[PDB]
Structures are given as C-alpha cells and as structure tokens.
Amino acid sequence: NDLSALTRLPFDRRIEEFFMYLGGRRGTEAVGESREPGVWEVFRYDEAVQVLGDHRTFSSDMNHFIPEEQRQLARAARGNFVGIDPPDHTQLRGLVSQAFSPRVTAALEPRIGRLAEQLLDDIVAERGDKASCDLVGEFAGPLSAIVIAELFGIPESDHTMIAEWAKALLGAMQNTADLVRRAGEYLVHHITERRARPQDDLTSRLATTEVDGKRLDDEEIVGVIGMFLIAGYLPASVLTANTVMALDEHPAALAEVRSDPALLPGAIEEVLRWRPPLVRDQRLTTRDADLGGRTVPAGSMVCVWLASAHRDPFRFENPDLFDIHRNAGRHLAFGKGIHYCLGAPLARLEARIAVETLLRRFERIEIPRDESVEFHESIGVLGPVRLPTTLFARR
Numbered sequence: 001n002d003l004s005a006l007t008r009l010p011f012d013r014r015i016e017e018f019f020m021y022l023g024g025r026r027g028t029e030a031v032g033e034s035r036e037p038g039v040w041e042v043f044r045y046d047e048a049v050q051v052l053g054d055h056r057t058f059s060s061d062m063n064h065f066i067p068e069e070q071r072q073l074a075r076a077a078r079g080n081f082v083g084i085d086p087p088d089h090t091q092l093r094g095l096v097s098q099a100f101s102p103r104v105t106a107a108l109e110p111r112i113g114r115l116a117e118q119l120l121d122d123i124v125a126e127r128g129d130k131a132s133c134d135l136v137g138e139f140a141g142p143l144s145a146i147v148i149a150e151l152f153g154i155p156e157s158d159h160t161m162i163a164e165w166a167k168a169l170l171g172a173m174q175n176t177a178d179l180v181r182r183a184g185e186y187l188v189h190h191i192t193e194r195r196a197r198p199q200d201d202l203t204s205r206l207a208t209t210e211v212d213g214k215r216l217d218d219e220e221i222v223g224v225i226g227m228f229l230i231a232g233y234l235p236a237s238v239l240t241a242n243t244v245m246a247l248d249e250h251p252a253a254l255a256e257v258r259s260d261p262a263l264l265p266g267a268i269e270e271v272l273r274w275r276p277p278l279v280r281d282q283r284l285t286t287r288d289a290d291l292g293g294r295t296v297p298a299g300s301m302v303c304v305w306l307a308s309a310h311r312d313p314f315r316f317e318n319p320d321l322f323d324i325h326r327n328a329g330r331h332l333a334f335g336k337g338i339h340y341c342l343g344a345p346l347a348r349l350e351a352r353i354a355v356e357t358l359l360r361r362f363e364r365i366e367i368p369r370d371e372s373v374e375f376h377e378s379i380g381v382l383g384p385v386r387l388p389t390t391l392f393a394r395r
C-alpha cells in the first residue's frame with residue numbers, strides 16, 4: 001500500500017493514487033486487513049455505518065483494555081468526550097449539546113460575514129486588484145479559528161492571537177505541552193470571567209446550563225472549549241479550501257454557483273462527500289466482531305475510510321463524479337451515531353459564507369497544479385495547509 005509515500009506525492013497525484021488505492025480494495029472486499037500488524041480497514045458504506053453505529057463493539061476509547069489501575073494517565077482529560085464511550089459520553093455531550101443550541105450557531109452568521117470581508121480586505125490592500133495570497137494561511141485558517149473564538153465569546157483583541165495559537169498547535173514537543181498548558185490557563189480566566197459577568201456566548205451558556213440537575217464545572221468547560229478548537233479548526237478551514245479547489249477543478253459547476261449562489265450549500269455537501277477534509281475515523285474493537293463477511297478480533301484497531309465509503313457505488317450513483325446537484329445527504333464526513341459532529345451546522349455556515357464572499361469579490365481565482373499547493377501531511381486529512389492563489393477582483 002505504501003500509504004506514507006502518498007503523503008509525499010504532489011497533491012494532484014496524491015488524490016489520484018489515494019482513491020485508486022481505496023477503489024481497488026473496495027472493489028474486492030468490504031473489509032480487510034492492512035500491512036500494519038493488528039489493524040483492519042473498512043472500504044464500503046454499509047460496514048462503515050455499522051462500525052460507527054455499534055459503539056459497544058467498536059469503541060472510541062483507545063485505552064479500553066488498559067487495566068483500571070494503570071488508567072489514570074490513559075484517561076481522557078476532563079471535558080473531552082470525543083475519546084470516550086457511554087455512559088460517560090452521554091452525560092457530558094448532553095450538557096454541551098443543550099448549551100450549543102442551533103440558535104447559537106445561527107446568530108454568528110452576521111459576524112462570520114463581516115470577518116470574512118475583513119480578512120479579504122486585508123489581503124486586497126497589500127497587493128491591489130490582482131492579489132496573490134495563501135487562501136488557507138490568510139483566509140480559511142484565520143476564519144476557522146476566529147469563528148470558533150467568536151462562538152465562545154473570546155474578546156476581539158485576542159482573535160489574532162487565537163488564530164496564531166491554532167496555526168502553531170495544528171498544522172509531544174516541549175512547545176506543544178506549553179501551548180496546551182497556557183491555553184488551559186487562558187481559558188480558565190475566560191471562564192471565571194464569563195461565570196462572574198455572563199455575555200451572549202457559548203462559554204457563559206456552558207457555565208449556566210443544567211440537564212436533569214447536573215452542571216459542567218470550570219475544568220470540564222476548559223476541556224470542551226479546547227476540544228472544540230482542536231476538533232474544529234483544521235477541518236473547517238480545509239472544507240472552505242476544498243470547496244474553492246473542487247469548484248476550481250470543475251469550471252461548469254463553478255459557473256453554475258457563481259450565477260446562482262443558492263446552489264452553494266448543495267455544492268458544499270458534495271465536497272464533503274467527494275473530497276472530505278477528514279478522510280478516516282478510527283475505532284477499537286472491544287470484542288470479536290463480525291463485519292463484512294469477516295471476523296475482526298478483539299483488540300484490533302479499525303480504520304473506517306469515510307473517503308472510500310463515499311465512493312461506494314452501492315450507495316451513490318456515479319460515485320466518482322463530482323455533482324453539485326446530487327443528493328449527497330447520506331455522506332459520513334461529519335460522522336454518524338453518538339459522536340456525530342457538534343460543529344457540523346457551524347462548519348456548513350462558515351464554509352458557505354467564506355466561498356459566497358470570495359466568489360462575489362473575485363471574478364477569477366487562479367490555483368496552481370504545482371507543489372506550491374501543500375496538502376496536510378497526515379494520511380487522515382485530505383486538503384491544503386498552504387494554498388497559494390491569485391485573486392482578480394471583479395470589475
């Protein structure tokens with residue numbers, strides 16, 4: 001398979017041979033073993049769905065088997081429920097979900113609008129009507145970090161800082177430990193501040209919501225805020241750029257969307273299917289598991305290829321065709337079951353406004369096929385971290 005080699009190929013051929021790899025295996029088998037010793041891969045839709053649905057058999061807690069005595073440092077941090085299983089997940093997500101109601105996401109739409117325009121005006125001032133820039137570095141990445149910052153009611157002054165903090169951490173080392181620890185210190189101050197004097201933001205809501213007599217404490221809230229930033233930053237920025245790139249690579253689709261921007265959310269859903277930011281989702285078998293005509297032994301790492309599931313012709317017609325008019329609703333880009341992305345509404349809103357603004361303001365968006373386009377190094381990500389473009393402002 002040589003998956004590590006693919007992460008080093010030019011992005012265009014990385015995409016190619018990545019989907020060729022998945023295609024070949026998916027063609028023959030729903031499930032299979034990998035070169036890695038005790039790891040299985042999932043290639044087909046139904047089995048991907050089955051895996052995500054059956055959280056009992058396929059755990060999200062990678063330290064499931066670690067003895068309860070040696071579990072203290074293997075335990076997930078207070079507030080982080082992405083790496084835990086019911087019933088611990090249900091209670092924590094229950095609280096966060098109640099607080100993070102759809103109207104919290106909806107209310108951000110005007111700000112996201114204004115922020116996207118401001119980032120574009122900063123790029124335009126430096127290089128004029130024909131302005132070259134890094135779309136991820138100067139637009140999508142700041143927009144994703146600051147949007148999440150806005151959600152939690154982080155002061156306007158600290159936004160450029162938060163954007164830089166996110167770029168540093170996300171793109172072990174003593175610094176990595178520091179960034180995490182200092183973020184901790186910062187967020188505690190933010191929380192106690194918003195607990196004392198509340199404002200219309202998610203931090204204050206997290207601090208004041210009850211669910212059947214239960215609340216979140218300051219240290220859990222820190223984990224939640226931190227979890228949102230870590231889970232949400234890269235993928236959202238990648239969705240915004242993958243949309244720009246996918247439309248660029250399809251002039252007809254692009255023309256349709258430019259002429260009727262109502263088509264854009266549908267286009268984004270297609271992007272999520274056809275070039276998902278997060279390309280795999282991992283689980284750990286708690287027991288011997290019958291899947292795809294095969295038995296997966298207890299203790300096995302399972303790697304669910306979401307990207308392959310989306311190309312499964314059993315589930316999607318003409319799977320390898322990018323079609324902004326397709327019903328992409330069944331895609332798994334935001335996961336499925338109990339761990340389904342809490343940021344999915346916000347990401348769709350973030351992405352829609354960011355590309356809506358770029359198309360309205362720039363009549364030409366030129367993107368190279370060089371190695372100047374730098375895709376994120378992880379096999380589990382598919383999209384750029386450095387995307388140089390040339391923006392020609394509409395006359």
Ligand code: HEM
Pocket residue numbers: 060081082083093148227228229231232233235236237239277278281332333334335336338339340341342343344346347
């Ligand atoms: C387009 C961008 C995004 C993608 C592709 C994405 C994808 C995902 C996926 C696949 C999961 C499921 C992980 C699993 O099953 O174990 C997930 C969980 C999550 N995402 Fe996102 N996400 C995105 C943006 C965001 C944003 C903007 C936020 C909020 C700041 C966010 C917060 C979360 C949280 C909190 C979870 C965990 C929910 C849980 O564990 O129950 N995500 N995301």
